Amino acid sequence: EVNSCDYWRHCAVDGFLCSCCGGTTTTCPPGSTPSPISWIGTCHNPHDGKDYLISYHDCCGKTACGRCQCNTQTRERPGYEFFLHNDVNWCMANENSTFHCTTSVLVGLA
Amino acid sequence: EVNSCDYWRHCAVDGFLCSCCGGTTTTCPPGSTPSPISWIGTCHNPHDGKDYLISYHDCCGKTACGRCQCNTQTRERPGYEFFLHNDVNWCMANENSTFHCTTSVLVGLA
Amino acid sequence: EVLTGGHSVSAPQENRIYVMDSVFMHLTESRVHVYDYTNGKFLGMVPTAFNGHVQVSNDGKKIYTMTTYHERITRGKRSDVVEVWDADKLTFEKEISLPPKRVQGLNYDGLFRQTTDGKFIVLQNASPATSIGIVDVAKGDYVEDVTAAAGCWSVIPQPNRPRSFMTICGDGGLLTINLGEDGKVASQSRSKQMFSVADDPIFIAPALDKDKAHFVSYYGNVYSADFSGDEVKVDGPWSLLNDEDKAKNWVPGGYNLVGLHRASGRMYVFMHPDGKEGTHKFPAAEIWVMDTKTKQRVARIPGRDALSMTIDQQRNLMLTLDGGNVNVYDISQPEPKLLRTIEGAAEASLQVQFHPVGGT
Amino acid sequence: EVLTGGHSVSAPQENRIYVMDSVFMHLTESRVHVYDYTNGKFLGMVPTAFNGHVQVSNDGKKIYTMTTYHERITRGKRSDVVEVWDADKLTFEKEISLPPKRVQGLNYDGLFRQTTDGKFIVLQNASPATSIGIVDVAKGDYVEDVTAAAGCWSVIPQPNRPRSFMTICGDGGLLTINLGEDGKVASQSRSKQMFSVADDPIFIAPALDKDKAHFVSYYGNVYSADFSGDEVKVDGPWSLLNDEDKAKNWVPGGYNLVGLHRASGRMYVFMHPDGKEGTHKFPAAEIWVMDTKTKQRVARIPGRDALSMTIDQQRNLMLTLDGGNVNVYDISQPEPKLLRTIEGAAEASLQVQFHPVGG
Ligand SMILES: NCc1ccccc1
Numbered sequence: 001e002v003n004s005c006d007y008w009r010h011c012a013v014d015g016f017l018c019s020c021c022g023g024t025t026t027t028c029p030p031g032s033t034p035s036p037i038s039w040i041g042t043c044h045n046p047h048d049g050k051d052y053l054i055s056y057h058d059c060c061g062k063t064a065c066g067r068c069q070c071n072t073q074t075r076e077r078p079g080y081e082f083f084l085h086n087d088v089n090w091c092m093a094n095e096n097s098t099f100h101c102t103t104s105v106l107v108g109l110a
Numbered sequence: 111e112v113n114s115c116d117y118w119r120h121c122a123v124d125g126f127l128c129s130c131c132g133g134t135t136t137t138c139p140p141g142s143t144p145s146p147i148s149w150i151g152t153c154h155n156p157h158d159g160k161d162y163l164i165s166y167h168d169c170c171g172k173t174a175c176g177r178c179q180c181n182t183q184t185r186e187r188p189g190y191e192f193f194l195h196n197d198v199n200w201c202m203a204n205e206n207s208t209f210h211c212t213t214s215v216l217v218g219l220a
Numbered sequence: 221e222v223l224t225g226g227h228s229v230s231a232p233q234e235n236r237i238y239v240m241d242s243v244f245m246h247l248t249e250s251r252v253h254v255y256d257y258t259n260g261k262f263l264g265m266v267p268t269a270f271n272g273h274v275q276v277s278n279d280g281k282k283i284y285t286m287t288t289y290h291e292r293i294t295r296g297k298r299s300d301v302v303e304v305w306d307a308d309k310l311t312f313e314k315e316i317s318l319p320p321k322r323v324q325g326l327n328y329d330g331l332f333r334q335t336t337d338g339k340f341i342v343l344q345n346a347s348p349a350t351s352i353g354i355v356d357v358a359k360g361d362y363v364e365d366v367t368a369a370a371g372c373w374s375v376i377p378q379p380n381r382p383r384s385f386m387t388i389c390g391d392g393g394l395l396t397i398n399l400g401e402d403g404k405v406a407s408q409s410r411s412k413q414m415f416s417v418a419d420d421p422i423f424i425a426p427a428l429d430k431d432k433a434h435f436v437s438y439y440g441n442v443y444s445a446d447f448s449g450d451e452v453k454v455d456g457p458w459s460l461l462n463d464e465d466k467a468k469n470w471v472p473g474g475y476n477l478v479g480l481h482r483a484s485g486r487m488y489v490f491m492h493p494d495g496k497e498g499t500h501k502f503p504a505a506e507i508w509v510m511d512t513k514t515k516q517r518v519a520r521i522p523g524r525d526a527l528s529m530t531i532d533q534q535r536n537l538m539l540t541l542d543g544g545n546v547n548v549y550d551i552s553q554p555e556p557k558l559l560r561t562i563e564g565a566a567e568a569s570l571q572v573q574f575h576p577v578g579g580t
Numbered sequence: 581e582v583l584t585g586g587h588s589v590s591a592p593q594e595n596r597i598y599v600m601d602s603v604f605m606h607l608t609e610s611r612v613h614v615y616d617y618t619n620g621k622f623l624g625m626v627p628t629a630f631n632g633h634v635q636v637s638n639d640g641k642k643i644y645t646m647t648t649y650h651e652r653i654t655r656g657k658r659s660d661v662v663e664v665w666d667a668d669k670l671t672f673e674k675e676i677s678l679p680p681k682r683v684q685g686l687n688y689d690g691l692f693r694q695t696t697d698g699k700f701i702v703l704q705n706a707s708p709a710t711s712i713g714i715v716d717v718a719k720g721d722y723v724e725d726v727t728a729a730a731g732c733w734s735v736i737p738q739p740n741r742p743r744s745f746m747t748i749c750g751d752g753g754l755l756t757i758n759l760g761e762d763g764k765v766a767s768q769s770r771s772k773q774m775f776s777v778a779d780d781p782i783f784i785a786p787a788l789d790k791d792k793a794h795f796v797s798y799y800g801n802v803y804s805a806d807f808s809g810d811e812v813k814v815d816g817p818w819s820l821l822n823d824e825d826k827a828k829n830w831v832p833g834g835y836n837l838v839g840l841h842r843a844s845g846r847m848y849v850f851m852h853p854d855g856k857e858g859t860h861k862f863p864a865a866e867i868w869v870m871d872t873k874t875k876q877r878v879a880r881i882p883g884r885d886a887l888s889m890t891i892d893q894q895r896n897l898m899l900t901l902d903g904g905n906v907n908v909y910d911i912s913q914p915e916p917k918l919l920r921t922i923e924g925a926a927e928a929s930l931q932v933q934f935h936p937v938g939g
Pocket residue numbers: 014015058086087088089090099102324325326
């Protein structure tokens with residue numbers, strides 16, 4: 001692996017994997033706050049062969065984790081399709097917008 | 111020659127040489143402010159064979175220059191000989207204490 | 221000897237470039253590095269706190285930055301600002317307060333721009349609802365929030381009008397905004413659909429001429445918006461690619477990935493082979509040079525893993541940038557010529573800009 | 581799935597270490613990285629703005645940081661603070677205002693300490709005039725400014741008294757300060773001269789026992805301060821060096837360069853050959869293990885270019901740190917055994933600390 005940029009769920013992560021930062025794929029590291037908003041990826045699960053919607057919520061309010069940086073862009077689109085776009089800080093609307101790390105939350109089947 | 115950590119007058123620099131940072135050996139880069147206080151080094155000038163007192167003023171109020179980092183320690187002493195000590199920020203009393211770079215100002219013969 | 225401050229930048233303005241270092245690993249200490257492109261000399265810097273953006277005033281006198289502060293960095297009240305800095309002294313002059321929704325994101329040119337007349341800064345907001353902010357530089361005021369641009373992204377100034385710009389919208393068309401002398405919206409218009417958002421998404425970076433803009437797509441097509449007349453006329457696609465190119469799956473990739481040399485109509489584009497879903501931000505295997513009139517490729521040269529570029533019309537130069545190093549090219553002839561590489565200009569930069577010369 | 585916050589550190593307190601990353605290249609974004617020493621896992625972090633300092637409360641419950649803010653980082657009003665953070669949630673709880681003179685400098689332990697009883701934080705000021713500041717943790721207040729410590733530097737707590745500490749002064753002696761239960765100075769004393777400031781300067785880092793502290797010098801001598809009584813008794817020098825060692829000019833070097841294993845009296849010191857003027861902060865070629873009772877070396881091992889160390893008494897561990905990597909040693913026997921290296925623990929760290937387990 002989950003700490004690899006090649007892990008299937010991480011197909012549109014631009015950031016640091018929270019699982020390398022004292023968190024997990026679906027939990028913020030201690031003392032960092034989840035974003036209520038996110039960009040969305042459609043990622044292929046090579047195990048069951050199905051595509052899934054993944055919500056990339058940032059964890060916020062701490063400075064950059066610095067570990068497990070990824071820049072994967074599967075199905076990513078520019079800011080005129082805003083919620084498919086990953087060159088913006090999805091912490092932008094948090095009480096503190098400082099970006100710490102990115103989670104990869106499974107929403108469901110695409 | 112002056113941008114090298116082994117330039118003779120840089121014998122007690124802990125910091126970034128200002129001459130690599132858009133300034134010179136005795137001038138702060140644009141928009142950074144000289145410190146009124148400094149640590150002092152005694153450095154041997156191998157070209158005339160004499161020892162000189164060098165005053166290591168910092169330039170302050172801009173973030174780290176990052177270029178030409180040196181950590182030379184000739185005649186440097188701990189904080190109980192405070193003005194011979196270079197593990198403290200000599201920008202500490204400036205209006206803004208953010209450390210930018212270090213200058214090597216010739217005071218005179220030792 | 222005596223240590224002095226108060227000094228000006230050592231090289232003249234016409235030698236200067238601005239490398240916007242995000243310092244993504246330590247994004248709260250982003251900064252602008254000022255270099256002499258003629259010899260690679262570091263000239264100075266401007267600190268820009270969390271995820272700074274930067275531009276130079278059209279008149280070449282001031283540096284504008286946009287950034288976010290908090291009272292205690294990772295906690296406390298937020299202040300989004302534009303700052304005005306003196307270009308020659310690299311000193312802070314004025315802060316202009318923004319509402320706390322300025323775009324936080326990578327440094328595409330179109331997120332922080334100015335009207336052609338230089339009177340207004342035009343910036344992208346996202347709360348995450350999008351709008352365009354207008355700042356009156358002289359007055360030091362935030363003049364209005366263009367909520368008409370909801371669902372659109374980025375700012376493309378129209379160089380043939382004093383206070384007009386366009387933005388790319390989710391309908392695949394362009395919204396044009398014309399400001400009054402006070403900076404408020406005086407009129408607006410929407411173009412017909414230029415591109416399919418689903419089937420042929422374009423990169424936002426324009427190849428900008430005086431009266432038209434060209435855009436490249438994920439699949440190597442080119443689209444155009446002509447604003448010489450009363451309203452914007454759109455067209456495309458035409459392909460950057462010949463059969464051999466298509467067989468090797470060449471497509472564009474990068475960030476600020478295109479440029480236009482206005483006098484010749486040459487368009488510069490980063491390209492890579494073996495393109496597929498997910499490769500649109502890959503480093504350049506090559507730079508292709510297209511004649512936008514004939515729609516033919518006139519040169520191809522190694523890309524040096526470049527991601528972003530910028531063009532100087534006045535000296536016929538192209539800079540390219542791979543994240544850390546800046547390459548300087550002479551583009552006075554169809555084949556670019558590499559002059560030098562400035563190594564270690566940044567740790568994490570996706571944007572470089574020239575200090576403006578002339579341009580009236 | 582749903583993203584959640586509010587979580588605690590995943591490993592027990594007893595596994596945790598604190599790597600203070602100055603991030604000197606970007607010193608406004610210094611931070612503390614929390615690691616599990618048993619497996620090298622990154623557990624979390626605490627942001628510490630410009631040139632932060634850190635310690636963990638003696639009871640293990642809180643993390644204390646010391647830092648400087650300005651309203652606009654590089655301009656605007658300055659705020660020097662101590663912050664109290666929860667140790668398990670790694671969340672901010674309280675800011676304590678300091679006068680705008682807290683020490684800005686590299687992370688020697690002795691710049692930011694606490695009383696043995698944990699009730700007071702004891703920190704070094706430099707304006708550049710020096711004094712020692714006292715923070716009452718419970719009250720969240722700066723309560724005392726020890727101007728008697730002018731011309732001295734660094735804080736060495738006495739582990740055998742609840743609220744006493746020493747500082748090294750420009751006369752080559754030690755000033756001892758005993759705080760009252762209000763955090764105000766209750767008494768003080770000054771030792772006789774321990775070392776020659778000019779002729780045999782000591783490193784400030786103590787090898788600290790329950791009732792005495794040892795110091796090493798630029799030339800490889802050892803000095804001691806015995807505080808088993810109210811008056812500190814000083815002695816030294818004895819040499820770290822035998823004749824063979826002297827022939828190759830071995831001297832100490834580093835930052836937080838010494839440590840003491842209290843149960844055995846073994847002192848650990850970073851050393852390098854070919855010492856001369858200007859080498860006192862060189863990385864270690866070796867670690868030497870000294871018997872402080874017999875005043876002789878017992879062992880020597882490769883130094884792995886380490887600069888700083890710390891000791892855990894109860895698990896018999898030593899960590900060393902080369903700026904970026906942390907080495908974990910078992911010191912239950914006289915020869916340290918290397919257990920593992922944690923690579924990339926920091927970009928620019930000169931200080932690592934264990935989570936306290938002693939209560
Ligand atoms: N989620 C990617 C990201 C984070 C912060 C800033 C830019 C992009």
